[model samples]
Structure formats: C-alpha cells, structure tokens
Target chain A: MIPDEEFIRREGVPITKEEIRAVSIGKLNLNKDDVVVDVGCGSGGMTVEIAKRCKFVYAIDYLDGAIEVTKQNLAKFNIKNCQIIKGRAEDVLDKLEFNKAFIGGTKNIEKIIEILDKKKINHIVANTIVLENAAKIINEFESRGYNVDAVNVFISYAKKIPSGHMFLAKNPITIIKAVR
Target chain B: MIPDEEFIRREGVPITKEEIRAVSIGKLNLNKDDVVVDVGCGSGGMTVEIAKRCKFVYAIDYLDGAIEVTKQNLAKFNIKNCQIIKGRAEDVLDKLEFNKAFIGGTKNIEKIIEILDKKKINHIVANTIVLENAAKIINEFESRGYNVDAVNVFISYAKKIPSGHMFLAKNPITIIKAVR
Candidate 1:
C-alpha cells in the first residue's frame, strides 16, 4: 500500500487510490491502440497508470527530475508502452501526432492552444487556470469548433480531527477538469 | 433574474449560483453582528452577499476598478453594510480586527501564515492556489493550531456541444474552499 504521506508529498496533495483510479484509469477510456500525450507528466503517476491500458503514451515534461522520476516509477509497474520526452511542449509537441492529449498544469495555456490548433488532436483532457481564467480559455476552445465534454470538480476528503472526537472533516483541494 | 452571460462577463467565468452560495454564504456561517473581511473582493459579488448577513464587511482590493465595481454592484443589491477599501490586504488588514477573513484570490498565502502565526485570526475561508496547494496551506495552518472544519469543491457547468438533437455540457471551474 502506498503511504498517504508519500502520495501527498509526491503529488503535492493526498488523493485516494479510488481517486487515482477514477481520474486516470477510469475516465481516460483508453483502448488497446490509442496514443495519448501526458503534458506536464509529473513523476509518471498518471502516465504509468494510463500506459497499462493504452497502446502507447508520449510523456513529456520540462523538468528533468520529473521525467527521471517518471521513468523510475514506470519501471516499478513494468510498463513498456511509454515514450518519454524531455523539453517544453512548444519545443517538442510537433514530433508526433496524438489521437488524444491529456494536458495538465500549464502556466501559459496559450502555448498549448497554439499546438492544439495546429494538430488534429482530439479528445483533450486538461485542467484550466485557477479561478476566473478558466472560462476565458474554455471559451477560446469552444470558438474553434471542438466539442467540450464534461467539466468536473475534483474533490477529496479526509478526517480533519479524527472522526471519533471531531465534529468535522476538512476538504483540501478542488481541481477543474476540462474535456474536449 | 441574473443573466448567465452578464455573470460570466463580469466574473470572467460561469459559476453556478449554488456554487457561489456554497463559497460565499455557506462557508462563512455569517451572523448579524459578525465583522467580515473580504480580501480581493472582486465586484463585491461575495462581499454584497456577505453584507446581507453580517453587520459590517471591509471589502478590500488593490485595483481601483474592483473597488468601484464592488460599490456599484453592492448598490444594486441595496447592501449598505460594506466599506470598500482601495488597497491591498497587507496595507489595511491591520486596521480592523475581523471575526472572519475571506481571502478570495490573493497571491501571497505565506502572509496568511504570518498572520495566523500571530494568532490574530479566528476563521479563514480561501480558494488556495489549486487543490493541492489548498491542502498544503491548510496543513500549514493546522501545524500552527486551527482546525479545518470543511472543505468542498465548487464547480460551475455550462453548455458545450450541440448536436442536431443533443447538446453536451463542458468546462467546469473548480474552486476549493477551506473554512476554519
């Protein structure tokens, strides 16, 4: 079992195994021959999981440490369908054509938009900028004639003060997921 | 009746009334005599709503347009209990003691740590950087002393795809709330 501390420290927050299964493996809807791109593929957490079902995954990250960590983690799962790329998406995204792109945690989304506009990349699953900027970016995507799917709010719960003695538990994180 | 278009344009996003109510009024647990501090009070949407329940609110923002907009929007709601401050939270937070502080979208959460370290705050309601950062920040607060009562994910859904007979909804924004 993965310790909660290791999960939170690595992912930067605690997520249940159920959440990991729900978001990465369950909703991904990967087929045997599907090629997916994991942009900002941090630590290979999602990439390694998705690779189990998909035919191939192109995992790209700007951080060398993150890419190396992903490589290490993927080794643990004994997955061999992933091709890791190290560099900015702007610099390296054009190297291949992806049927689906699962982009995550980008500071400048316009760069990603430029890449998506050029490629016939379908079925984009991404997280938008925090707070108000999400609508602006989402609007830009809709204007380009792509079908936006469900936007989900990712929530996780934990016992705040120990269930036996405390009156309440606190929620820690909320994430917005956009699909196209 | 509030038009969705107008709300989206002003707020830069399409957030549901239920989600707004969950963050604005529900988290605070406002009372008639309580003093509330609305940091980064954009257009007074949450501020004016809070004013309806609280005795007084210090609606603060560094942007002059935000302050002006808040004043205008509050007038529309006929809310007279809010005082608009045209400055950053750092400048005027020391002036008044608040029963609750609403840090809507301020960048420097470290300052919250500083203030909380002084034991000057009772309740804090915030939308942390993202889901993970929110949890991390809450943990920082927990290390000091406060208890996290509830955390919820707020999402707003809107129409996305329009087939000949069917339309789909997409692109939801997630705002995580941490209340003490």
Candidate 2:
C-alpha cells in the first residue's frame, strides 16, 4: 500500500511499507557489508528506510529545512545507521566511497556512472523523472559492459488539483539498477 | 475523470477533460496573440487539448519518435494549430517568440529559464519530481518576483506485489504553474 496523504504529509513523502517490501533490498548481489549512498535524500524518507535494511546509508541533501526534518524523523523512527551529509552529490562524491549508490533527486547521472566506474561501485539504483535521459544512462552502463539489471518504471495514482481529481500521474521516474 | 489505462498506454501520459476543466484555462492569462512553447509534447496531449484556446503552440522534442507520435496523435484528434519542431527546447527557443511555456519533461531547467527570461515569458506550466533540486528551480522563479501560483503534489496507486500484502505502489510528482 502506498502511504496515504496524511502519513505522507506528516512523513514528507508517502513511502508505504509496501514500497519497502517491493524494494530489492540487498538484492543487487552485493555483500552484506556493502555501503549505500542515497543522494538527494529528502526528509530521510528513502534514506532512513533503506538504512533499516542496509549496513549504512549515506543520506545527502542541500536544504537545511529538509536535512533537519530528516534528522528529526529518523530519530523519531529510531534509525541510527545513516550518515546525513549536507552538500551536493556532485561536489562531495570524491570524499566518500560506497559499494552501491542510489540517486534519489540528484540529476548527476554522468557523474554517477563516473564514480561508479572509478570507485568500482558494484551496484547502483537511480530514481529520476528524466525518463528519456535515464534510458540513455542505462544504455551507457550497458555499452560499457556493466550488467544493467533493470529499469523499473514506478507508476501510482495521485490526487491532483482542487477538484479532487485522482489520476495516474506518470512521474516519469526510472530506477536503473546496475551492477559491475 | 482520468484517461483510461489503455488510452494512456497507446497515446502515452493520461490527461483527462476533467483535469482540463478544473484548471482555469483563462487564468493562464495569455494574450490572444501570444505564442506558447510546449516541450516534450507527447502525443500532443496538452498541446492539442489546449491548442485552440491558445494562439499557437510550438511543440518540440529531441527525439524523432516523440515528434512523429505527437504529430500522429494530434492528427488523430484533428488538431492542426500546433507546429511540431524536432529538436531540444533550448536549441529551438531562439527561433520563436513565446509569451508562455509548458514543459512536460525535466530538461535543463536552468537553460529553460534563461530562454524564458530572454523571451519574457509571463507564464509557465512544468512537471517535475518532488526532488531537492526540483524545488530550487521553482525557487529561482519565485525569487525573481514571479508568482508561484501552484505546487500540486500528485501520488498514484499501483498494484499489490504480494497477495494480502496491503501495499500499493505510490509515485509522487509536482506540477508548478508560475507567472510573472
């Protein structure tokens, strides 16, 4: 079940337990000790959520409001394994290392693959609304001979406008899971 | 009413008459002679749906497939006022004088704004994800004294992965309509 409007409003993004289950946690064929980075980790929604099942989650965002909210929310949820970083992913990538990476909001697709190649990141999952570009990014990894596992397009019904119109809003997000 | 799944699957992106009715078309506040640019005009969904209401629409995209699909879709709908351009919005912005703009995809937001500012675009409707950098783009327009009219967060429901799991997939998107 998708998180309802009330919970989403309170939690910042309507991430339900169902999405957590659907998520291929540690299924990127990575070792249990693998580190994961959640770029543009807003309100710690996906970050802390992933931290609950991963060894460590590097949650990064630029906004203080969101960062503070994430800190509070994670603490409230008793999540203690995430390291929240306040900076742009492109600028701070050199300072970190990870066996896996997830781009929540960052559009640094080129940089993502670059880091993945240079750091020898074993796995990556990126979520972005740039669907067309995402296809290209996935193809780039594939062309480089890396295993492009999947590009899952997640669709959902959303409330829109003041007239209480609910419809399928194709968010145009593609999750490109790649492995070396 | 949302467009049916089959229709969206065939034509791409579900847009309905109800949504069109709910949105104040007149409130777009365009002069009768004003020109508008519609980027990522998939199947000419919003373009053909609003073509007659606006003076002219410069429908554009980078992919030939999208352009052909939009043209075919518009023809299917008996729409002819829109001019389909095969290229990126940034590359083609210099060829037109647009007072209004609508982007259905996440292109280079900064470049888009630069073109809009140069063209003195007074109104804009854009679809973006609820990502961290996404808000920054909107904030840029807001900080420039433009009226950020709306930020509609849309969530949609998907199928349950496991039986009795009680989990529905949710995807959240943001639509921003702004005016100077």
Candidate 3:
C-alpha cells in the first residue's frame, strides 16, 4: 500500500490511511485475476492500491472533488488499468464488470447492493468511516445472504510530550467484509 | 494463509480462527526479513502462518497442550523456520531476538513489553480475543510511547437453513497493532 502522504489530497475530503486500507484490502483477498469496483473512490488512494494487485479496477464517485482527485491520483501513479466513472455507483455499476468490490461510502448502499447479485460479486468490503450506524449495513448484507465480518477500527498516533507521549485519535471507522 | 481445517485442533485448546489471524497479521505488516516472537502461542495456528511469511519465529506457550500441538503443526507443514519453546513468554522473552511480535494472551504483557526496547522490536500486534479489557493493552501501548491502533473484530459465517442461510458466530477478537 502507498503511504498516506504520497496520495494527493484535498482539505475536506478524507483519504483512508494506508494502514486502515490494508486491513479492508486483506479481507477482500484480492488476486491478479480479479477485477475490483471501488464505490465512492475517495482520493483514489484505494483504487491505486487495488489497481496494482488486480486485473482491472472501476473507480466510481459522485462528489466532484472525489472524482477529480481520484482521477488525478490515478494518473499520478501512472495507473491505466482503471476506468474512472463520475456517478453514483448504483446507476453506473451494472455496466461494469468485477469480481471484488470496495464500498468506501455507505450512501445508497442498499440500492447498490441489489446489483451485487447481478454481478456475482464473490468478495466485497465496505468501510463505514463513522460510528453512527455500522451495524445497519452489516445487517443489510446478512439479510441478503452474505457472510459478514465487521470490525470497529480505532487508530491513534503518539505525539511526544515532556512526559513520554500522548495519543491523538483519528475518527473511528468500521470495516465490513461481506462474502457471497 | 492456511485454511481453518488444515490445522489439527484440540477439543478445548482453542485455535485462533484463520480469518481473525489474517486480520491481525495484516496489521503487523510482516515481511520475509522480519523475525517474529509469538508470545502465548496458541494451537500453533498463528505460528505456522507467521513462520511461512517471516525469516524466523520463536513460538512460546506455558501450556503443555499448546506447546505440543504447535510442534506437531509445524512438523506437518514441514516448516523449519520456527523454534517452539514451552514457557511463559515474560520469563522466556529476554533471550529472544526479534523485530516483530505477536501476543496472543495478554497476561503479564507490561513485563513483556519492557523487553521490547531492549530487543528494538519496532512492530508488534496483539490479539485480545475477547471484549473484556481490550482497552487495557491499548493504554499500555500508549503509556509506553507506542503508536496503537485497536480494532474490535466480529466475524460471522453464513450457514445453510430452510430460508436462505442463518449466521454462526465465532468469538470476537480485538487486534492491537503497536508501532514504536
């Protein structure tokens, strides 16, 4: 995975830290033959990393900041195996082909998940970047006959102080790996 | 990663499920050059997986059941890169040389962590496979000048039922990745 600083970033939009991204990507069990769809491709950081491991990637985002930055990040890495689509994934995903999926934003996830069967997506990971309701989507996946592994990830970096160090916390995120 | 069924198991001496182990190992960011110390090595399941990835592994356990099964699994896998020792890690770890560590049992961890600086262990991951006091060790890491990322992992698998499938759960585990 690429370092956090290496990815081009905008002020308000968040990029998944490389460490946290590694956890979700590992759950997907990506391989060279697999194609991945990254929904809400924030900063395109994960898309670049996924593109490196898999056969192809489809990067989708509805936010213009996200779409442009993701496209920029993809080019910065000289990645060509990925196609960037600037639209909500629920409408765009049916036209694309993939065996694995990464859903970065939980927006309209229910509608988007309805298409998982159409694509026969065998492996998928969804990261809920807030604690508000991580359980909602896990239940959604379970109800749809998918196996789910949900984790609450809390990451804190230490800052040196006169007395040892104190940890500064990142916003906690939840990762859900749902398998068919 | 080895499959869950491949490792021989004892009726009560629980093995870290392959899926959960993968999550913790992923947090470790292991490499071929790493020398890993498996403190409180259980069932030798993680020992085998780590041995396959790193340069060498020192597997330690206080239980006779744990020690014997770890040895058997290592032999079954034809792994020569590991050394299995039967003893409590806090007492035994002073002599080991390692840059990476895995702590399965959180017992006497503060004493064991005191030894990390002596060996210059830069990367370590601990799995507290329980809800009780996962925060205790994360606080321990922070107080010791370590960067800590703690995750609560809940894994559920789908089982066949009359209506679609029902879910069966393994005990949830917490994974802590601490970096110096």
lDDT of 3 by residue, B1-180 (tens): 234357878776788865666666667777889999998757888888889788999998888888888888988899899988778888889888888999898477677777875676778888885544465567767777887776665555545456544446667667787888
Best candidate, lDDT: 3
lDDT for model 2 comes to 0.59
Residues A15-103, model 2: lDDT tens digits: 42223212333223334476888777455666654676667878877777677777876776787888888998888876797777877
lDDT of prediction 3: 0.76
Q: Please report the TM-score between candidate 3 and the true structure.
A: 0.72
DockQ of each: 0.06, 0.01, 0.15
Error of 2 at B120 (Å): 63
Off by over 4 Å in 1: A1-154, A158-180, B1-18, B116-119, B129-132, B150-160, B164-180
In model 3, how large is the Cα lDDT of residue B45? 81
Note the B-chain TM-score for every model: 0.77, 0.76, 0.92
TM-score of each: 0.46, 0.43, 0.72
* Candidate 3 docking classification: incorrect
Candidate 2, residue A18: Cα displacement in angstroms equals: 5.8
Clashes of each: 1, 9, 0
lDDT tens readout by residue for model 1, B1-180 = 121223312544212343344333545667787898887746666676678778899887777667677777777778788888887677677777777877776656677556644646766666543655565666766766676643444343445445311222333223333434
Q: What local distance difference test score does each model get? A: 0.59, 0.59, 0.76
